[PDB]
UniProtKB/Swiss-Prot annotation, chain E:
Gene label: rpl35a
Molecular function GO terms recorded: structural constituent of ribosome; tRNA binding
Location of this chain's protein in the cell: Cytoplasm
Protein known as: Large ribosomal subunit protein eL33
Predominant location: cytoplasm
Function: Component of the large ribosomal subunit. The ribosome is a large ribonucleoprotein complex responsible for the synthesis of proteins in the cell.
Pfam family of the protein (one): Ribosomal_L35Ae
Organism: Xenopus laevis
InterPro entries (alphabetical): Ribosomal_eL33, Ribosomal_eL33_CS, Ribosomal_eL33_sf, Transl_B-barrel_sf
A GO CC term assigned to this protein in UniProt: cytosolic large ribosomal subunit
Keywords of the record: Cytoplasm, Ribonucleoprotein, Ribosomal protein, RNA-binding, tRNA-binding
Subunit structure: Component of the large ribosomal subunit.
Amino acid sequence: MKASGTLREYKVIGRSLPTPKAPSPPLYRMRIFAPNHVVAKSRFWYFVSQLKKMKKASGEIVYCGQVFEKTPLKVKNFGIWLRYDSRSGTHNMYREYRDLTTAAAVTQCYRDMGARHRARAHAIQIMKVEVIPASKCRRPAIKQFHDSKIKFPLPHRVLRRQHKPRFTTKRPNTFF
Amino acid sequence: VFKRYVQIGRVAYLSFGPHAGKLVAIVDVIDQNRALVDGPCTGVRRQAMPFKCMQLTDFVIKVPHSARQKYVRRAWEKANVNEKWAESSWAKKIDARQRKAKMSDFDRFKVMKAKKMRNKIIRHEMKKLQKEAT
Amino acid sequence: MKTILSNQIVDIPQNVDISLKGRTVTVKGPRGVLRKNFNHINVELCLMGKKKRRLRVDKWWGNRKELATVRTICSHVQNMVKGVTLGFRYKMRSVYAHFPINVVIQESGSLVEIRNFLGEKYIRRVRMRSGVACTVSQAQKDELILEGNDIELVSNSAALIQQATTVKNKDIRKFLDGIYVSEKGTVQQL
Amino acid sequence: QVLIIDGRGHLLGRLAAIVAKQVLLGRKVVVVRCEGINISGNFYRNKLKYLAFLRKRMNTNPSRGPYHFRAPSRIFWRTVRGMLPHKTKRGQAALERLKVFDGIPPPYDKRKRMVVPAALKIVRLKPTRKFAFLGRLAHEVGWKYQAVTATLEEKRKVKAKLHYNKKKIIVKLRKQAEKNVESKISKYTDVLKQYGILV
Amino acid sequence: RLWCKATFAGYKRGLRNQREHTALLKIEGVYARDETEFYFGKRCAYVYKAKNNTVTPGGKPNRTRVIWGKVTRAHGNSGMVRAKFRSNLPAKAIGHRIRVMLYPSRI
RNA sequence: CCCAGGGGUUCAGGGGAGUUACAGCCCCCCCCCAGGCAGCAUCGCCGUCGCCCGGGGCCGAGGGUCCGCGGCCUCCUCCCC
RNA sequence: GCCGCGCCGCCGAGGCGGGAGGGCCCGCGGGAGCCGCCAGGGGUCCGCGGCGAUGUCGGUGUCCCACCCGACCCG
RNA sequence: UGGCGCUGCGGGAUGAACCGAACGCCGGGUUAAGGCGCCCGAUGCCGACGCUCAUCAGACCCCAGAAAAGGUGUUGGUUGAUAUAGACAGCGCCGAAUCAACUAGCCCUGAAAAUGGAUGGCGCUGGAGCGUCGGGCCCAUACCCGGCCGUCGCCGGCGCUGGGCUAGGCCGCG
RNA sequence: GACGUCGCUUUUUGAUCCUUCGAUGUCGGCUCUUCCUAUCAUUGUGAAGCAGAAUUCACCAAGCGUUGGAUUGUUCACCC
RNA sequence: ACCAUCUGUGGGAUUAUGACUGAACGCCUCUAAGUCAGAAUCCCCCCUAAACGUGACGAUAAGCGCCGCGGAGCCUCGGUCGGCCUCGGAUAGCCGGCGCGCCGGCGGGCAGAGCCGCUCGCCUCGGGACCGGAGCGCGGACG
Ligand SMILES: [Mg+2]
Ligand SMILES: [Mg+2]
Ligand SMILES: [Mg+2]
Ligand SMILES: [Mg+2]
Ligand SMILES: [Mg+2]
Ligand SMILES: [Mg+2]
Ligand SMILES: [Mg+2]
Ligand SMILES: [Mg+2]
Ligand SMILES: [Mg+2]
Ligand SMILES: [Mg+2]
Ligand SMILES: [Mg+2]
Ligand SMILES: [Mg+2]
Ligand SMILES: [Mg+2]
Ligand SMILES: [Mg+2]
């Protein structure tokens, strides 16, 4: 996976091809986070193939639908248990994020795992994501926003629009 | 030294973006970069929005934490944000800047003629006081 | 990780009248006035309360390198407070084995001529900083007294005298001769 | 017709990348106060960058090798030249449109100087990062005219402030005249306030 | 003045190839691609002076000559435009003035 | 319009003075899926060129019907003159 | 798992037969017929302006020069 | 197996082999690989999120200098251990968390050659650095449409004449 | 700094045979200039099993200097 | 001809390093912000040269230099298509007005996102103005 743009939470459900020797194979549901469904199906045949004795050729996908956010208007703390392969070995990690959508936090995780650890999308395996209350958060960067009557200014606001006036007589101000 | 802060209920002006020029109320702070603003009386529904497109105003409404749009609208109307903003110099300079951009060629000619005589009358008054003071 | 707010409050006695002009802190006490600019720290300073004034040093959205400069602001102003009320009295002690160190103060405490260090014929003329006065201590044999309002100027004037009496090409562990700082106190002892 | 830019507070490459683009478009740029140009990174970095530049010389004949100009104007001039095809007639014509000066000489002392926000230190550099002035960098590599330029710029700011204080009285006189003749310009100020000219 | 100020910034090129049959103009007020639409199709003119006198339409002959063109499309995101002239612009005109007429008008 | 009529429970980025009170939040029930207005309009995807209108650039190579319509082949009425 | 029936759910996946009316449709009823129109087997105007023998018009590729780009000496 | 040799073209500054793509002569359009501070066509976006200060910073296939081993630089993560029967640190006082090990990013140490010099250069540190991505944009002799030239193929057409059929001619199509 | 182990250099030698056999004069010395530092001495420091003296280790550092002779064609050695 | 004789030089930022204040990390700490001392190195002065760099000044031949927008003409070379006649700067604050205060203005309207100039002529209203404006004009301050 390339993790292009904002990822989408797909509920890919699949099973093996029914055979006369073992008919009615069980249905397996996964929680895939791919930018589109074509990648969500390929990602499904990556974890199911290594967890079970199932292959894309000997199996079928019965449902691959996008999971919408049930509470898009509420800020939620997410906890993402994931394993990633460094240049040396594989390590388990647990990250925390504040966002509105589960897929917007997993997308925010790929941007962070690649920033702080140079981990590419093909090396990260998102194992578990669940909304966590503010009383069970561990990271101080996430837990510092768990404060009512929060207040902070915007110190030293960088002047954007640097080229709309390219040559001006007035030097810009950074205090507003 | 700071007077305008980012807090729950801080009315902000959107400089650019899809809702550029509208006022929103900061109902929640998601992270250091984004916030959860909601303008019920302006036309900006509840959504995430970065701080780089916001400009803090001198208006703070009393809204609870993560209250729905019904109560964010009351504080917006209780504090008379739209009335105080429309009479503030911030919006009046925006209104003046919008009217100057919609001036036709005949409007500029009326401004050219008005400013030509207005300056010559003021410029002579400055010469009148200089002669009087000496 | 960037902390939202990192503050610290400084207590200011009633005999000190402090004025803030941006980040330039100016304290005025019975012993004189001081003025130290902090425009390189990039923080927020505020004086709260008319009576029993305080100094609030705020830092918004700073990492560990920037949070460390918050207490440095407070510890500097507190030195400016005790410098205009109590002052600083750095005491030197001339240690020698055979040749006594002859110290003669000139220019009303603005120059220290060090003679007979290790029997050397060269004279060491150490000029004190502005506002720092050196004086041969009484009730002691080879003790000096450095007084002033700014600790950064008195403690630096002590380092100039101490590093001037440095032994070269010898075992410093054996030749422990020189004028060292023995006590870091105040002019007024309360 | 001439883009007069004040060099104080600007970065070296940020400003040279823009001035080099303006002269290629047939525009004449005059950059004054090149000693006030900032350079990112601590001073010891940029000083070593110039001392390493002093070592680049033709071993057999240094009079032919890289000419190491010490004036901040000629330092900024060599920076702009590096971003121009100075070995072609098109690039040489662009250099002829740029004139750099240490300080603000009389030909431009009585002018309004432009500022490039895309090259200022406040906009392009963090408040905690270290920077270096081109006036100090030049003084420590052989610029012999820092003290005389500082004194001439000191007197230039005295006569520029006396003019500004007189300009403040003219603005006070203009604002007072607007109140004393408001009854005669009421019909005119309503037209300007109608079309957003005033507010 | 009934024309907009433009600068002959150069020909349509890559890095090691140059197509002289297309020119890149830079309009004095257009600094974005969303503003170049107004100038699409406007008459372009490279007015210059020569030694010998040439006939002038609606007037007496003089040394003034001109190469007519037209803005065809936008170029990049910084307000640049492309223009094709009846004769390829001479390389001496790089950085000089190009008159962008207000006709054919569409307002 | 907390939609109203019966209410239950629940924590805290704890409002008012610890669990709604001088703000609110969440989870649940039985009453006409209370009604009323919007419908991928903060967030996707796709059409039987999908329906219609417009603008800019480039050029006309060749040089002895097919496919759509309309009027009349039927008598009048109205508008416009 | 098949097979039969029944119930129920299925924008109108739907097909047949008929009934009360309402009204939206048809390459059904219009062609060896005359006239025109044209999104129809590749462009035309049954549109138009300025300039005129001593200083202008076109060409002057192949005479010189200038600039941008490309470009190392052949066998 | 492809390629070079026998092969130009866009890109890698540069270069027989790498990446893209192979070539009649042109117009318009669109791209590939690769790019878009300036040289140098294109981000003069109010791009997104972090990481990083380097007194030898770093800057991307082939590819044109680094290792073992270290850092209480900074930022993540993992597994443990003490603490409001009051710890850690500092002199019972103090009153809120603290400590240890390990691991992973960037930076740093380790890191010495001879003419003066090479992210291509200038230069860049709210990025012109590294990672993760978005929108837009730039142009190859590649792709699309159109013109012209030639070759090749048509169980090609025409002896049934204003023009035509030197049929060894003429015409049409791909 | 043993047993181990990771590098660097191109002032040894080897390996290779890419350039030159219609020819690049080939060893040393003499002469002469500049460069490198992996610093012997001098300048400023840190460390010691640095008391002083002498010396050793290490750092910033190539500005300056590194000689006169016997033997040997010898570079290389050896000695005064 | 060291085979005679004479002369051969001052600073600046700093390297290493030793320190100051002081956090991070209640302590400590040369470092993180900020400071000090600091060298045969480095830069510069001294010194040698003097650029398709140049200043002041002298003298400038029937010829020649200034002064009549000389007063009219003939060959040539380029642009170009309204001006802005100016504080210093701050950026974790700024600007304006008034005698360290107070008042006023800040997504900069005392605003470069700006200001200023800008009816096709020639005569007539007097409705608003006292715009007393316009100089190939004569003098005087200011460089
Ligand atoms: Mg061969
Ligand atoms: Mg072949
Ligand atoms: Mg390369
Ligand atoms: Mg093409
Ligand atoms: Mg490039
Ligand atoms: Mg070690
Ligand atoms: Mg390194
Ligand atoms: Mg074709
Ligand atoms: Mg060994
Ligand atoms: Mg060394
Ligand atoms: Mg000794
Ligand atoms: Mg000999
Ligand atoms: Mg140090
Ligand atoms: Mg110093």
